[PDB]
Design a protein around this ligand. Sequence first.
Ligand SMILES: C/C(=C\C(=O)O)C(=O)O
Ligand SMILES: [Cl-]
Ligand SMILES: [Mg+2]
Ligand SMILES: [Mg+2]
Length: 307
Amino acid sequence: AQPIVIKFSHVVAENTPKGQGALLFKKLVEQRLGGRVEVDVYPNSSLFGDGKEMEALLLGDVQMLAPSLAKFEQYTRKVQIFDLPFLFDDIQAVDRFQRSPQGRALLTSMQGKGILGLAYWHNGMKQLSANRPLLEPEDARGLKFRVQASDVLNEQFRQLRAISRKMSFAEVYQGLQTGVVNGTENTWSNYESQKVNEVQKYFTESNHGLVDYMVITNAKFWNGLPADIREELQRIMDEVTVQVNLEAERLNRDARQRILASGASEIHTLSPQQRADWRQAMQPVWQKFRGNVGADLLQAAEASNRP
Ligand SMILES: C/C(=C\C(=O)O)C(=O)O
Ligand SMILES: [Cl-]
Ligand SMILES: [Mg+2]
Ligand SMILES: [Mg+2]
């Protein structure tokens, strides 16, 4: 009789990899478990936004989240590895890293704080945007970039002699519109779904980092479920993860196409030489975090680039 409630809060639009994943998890759970588990999905920060969502998870005011891997520094300093620029060539590489023993272990890295990782969901690679062309690294100097609340990402832009402003995802469009910030970094999906292309005249397809998610829950809640239900929820989560990874690839592509079709933002692609120039300018930031992430994680992550 007593329905089990899973409030699943996230900050993105519905027509995105995570937005679709949350909705699919709801659909499959409600259909397969016959209503014993209810999943209430809250997109676009409608329940909780960045930062506040984690506070809520610890207090039991929400049961499921899927934050960007860049937003966990207050819970563990190991997951920061995912934010290092140019560490992963593409999503295939980060996937290999995530499936390694160390990558699997990161799902438990916050267990001591009451947070359990259930899955990794892909979004895509990060691009650069601004209201001026970003062709070479010197072009970023003196600009104000919005970043996720991440020490690594702050330092990434400081390394370029740019200014970083940590701001919640909900506030990016207005920040750029009103000039609080000049540029940012994100996946095509996030840019187009929030209409940020309307307030950014230039994009550079840098693929200089990535956005992936860790699906997380409150340990007390998850462990308090009947074992048969918990195990089935995890199997369903595994099926949803497969679907999300598919949605991510095509949704990012479609978003890029929509931005290009507007004919009101330009997209600059880089030659290998041009991308290497950006890499040379940004890679020194790794020095500031190699202690936190550790030699082993770095080695494993770099090795993921070799099939
Ligand atoms: C990557 C971000 C959000 C998200 O959840 O996709 C962000 O830029 O805040
Ligand atoms: Cl937000
Ligand atoms: Mg219902
Ligand atoms: Mg909004």
